[PDB]
């Protein structure tokens, strides 16, 4: 079985929205590497694609909020931070401390475990510990 995270995000975008906005988003997520994150900054990518930085940002954000989140937009670990601010903006601090504890290594809470369980810092990757 192959990963359908990226493809799922593309379709979702064209679904909720379409036109020029979707175009910009695709471009940003189009100039990325097989690592799960854009190989070039948004500024440069926007200059090469012939698009205003500010504009590309707004569209990139609206599309980044989609599922999966814009891991390439912010980053691999940043995907969680933005995911909360967008999904659960009320528990931004809650998940913020959790994602930081799990990323740096630590214990997790019972409620957070389930909240983060629905997500994963390895959307386009795979890894686990024993």
Q: What is the distance in angstroms between the CA of the first residue and the CA of the last residue of the chain?
A: 23
Experimental method: NMR
Q: How many domains does the chain have?
A: 1
Cis preceding linkage at 68, omega within 30: yes
Helices of type H across the chain? 5-16, 20-28, 42-48, 53-64, 78-86, 92-104, 110-117
Distances (CA, A) of 35 to 10, 13, 20: 17, 21, 26
CB 68 within 8 A of CB 9: yes
* Sequence-distant (≥ 6) Cβ neighbours of residue 66 within 8 angstroms: 9, 12, 13, 16
CA-based radius of gyration for the chain: 15
Distances (CA, A) of 13 to 25, 29, 33, 75: 8, 12, 20, 19
Look at residue 86 and give its three-state secondary structure.
helix
| DSSP category for residue 19 | S
Range of the domain at 4: 1-130
CA 89-90-91 angle, 5° bins: 95
State the DSSP string of 107-126.
Answer: ---HHHHHHHHT--S-SS--
Breaks in the chain after (C-N > 2.5 angstroms): none
């Amino acid at each position: 079985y192959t990963p359908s995270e990226l493809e799922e995000l593309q379709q979702n975008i064209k679904l909720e929205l379409e036109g020029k906005e979707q175009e910009l988003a695709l471009e940003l997520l189009n100039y990325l590497n097989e690592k799960g994150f854009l190989s070039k900054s948004v500024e440069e990518i926007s200059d090469v694609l012939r698009c205003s930085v500010e504009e590309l940002e707004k569209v990139r954000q609206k599309v980044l909020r989609l599922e999966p989140l814009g891991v390439c937009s912010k980053d691999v670990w940043e995907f969680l931070e933005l995911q909360i601010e967008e999904i659960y903006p009320e528990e931004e601090e809650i998940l913020k401390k959790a994602l930081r504890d799990l990323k740096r290594g630590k214990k997790l809470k019972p409620e957070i475990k389930g909240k983060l369980s629905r997500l994963r810092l390895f959307p386009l990757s795979s890894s686990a510990e024993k």
